[PDB]
Amino acid sequence: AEKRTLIAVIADEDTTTGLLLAGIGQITPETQEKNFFVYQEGKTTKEEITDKFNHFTEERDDIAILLINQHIAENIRARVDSFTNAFPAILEIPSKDHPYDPEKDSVLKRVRKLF
């Protein structure tokens, strides 16, 4: 818990720009690595999303919350549903052209079950 202080992002152009403005972004100076990955609807491959998801969720010990556009998470719902650890907390948010469906949301499903 104590090591987890960053908010990571997997999201489209607009969403990412907004969050970066709020000041959540960070570059590890030695590795040149980032805590955000911009997504493009035609171009970004399912395999490439899964890499980043795994990377922020399991390969890195310092992410506290992972924000992700619901539409993007929908591409890898298998992987997202299977992830159950409390950390990082995973937050699916809507994007432009893709209104938020409650019932797709993996955390929200799990919480609905067991009410």
Partner: protein, 167 residues
């Protein structure tokens, strides 16, 4: 029952909140577009370029609530890190300032939603565990105790009877 409806409402209110998040953020994004278009400057480029260390972080904290332990997030804002100084915007600079204000407050809101989901996830695991204990107990110790005490009472009834033989 009463509780299941209250919990259904929470889930509804979370959905409502999630949608507003979408609207609030896209509106802000629109206003950056307006400025980018008007000024010719590329906001996305400049913003991303000036990232180094996070101004906006969080701190995971543990809160005991009536016995059950919950993880909460608290946003921590490093004041050592400066804000962005975007160049070539002129009048448009104030529009961007205001959008930044909005995005900051929106992100604080996401930290609170994250805490809330985290709460229910933990709460889920607590219920599971608690029901595991209850079943373990009920499988052996309860029945065994119920017998032993039944048996003990029968012994005492007979002793009582054997004393009351007095005539």
């Amino acid at each position: 029952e009463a509780l299941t409806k209250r919990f259904r409402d929470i889930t509804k209110r979370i959905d409502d909140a999630k949608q507003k998040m979408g609207r609030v953020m896209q509106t802000a994004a629109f206003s950056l577009a307006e400025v980018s278009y008007a000024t010719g400057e590329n906001i996305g480029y400049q913003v991303q370029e000036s990232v180094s260390t996070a101004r906006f972080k969080v701190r995971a904290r543990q809160e005991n609530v009536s016995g059950v332990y919950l993880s909460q997030f608290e946003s921590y804002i490093d004041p050592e890190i400066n804000d962005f100084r975007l160049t070539g915007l002129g009048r448009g600079g104030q529009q961007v300032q205001r959008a930044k204000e909005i995005y900051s407050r929106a992100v604080e809101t996401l930290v609170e939603l994250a805490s809330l989901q985290t709460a229910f996830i933990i709460l889920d695991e607590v219920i599971k565990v608690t029901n595991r204990r209850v079943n373990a107990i009920e499988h052996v110790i309860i029945p065994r105790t119920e017998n032993t005490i039944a048996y003990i009472n029968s012994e005492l009834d007979e002793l009582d009877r054997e004393e009351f033989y007095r005539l």
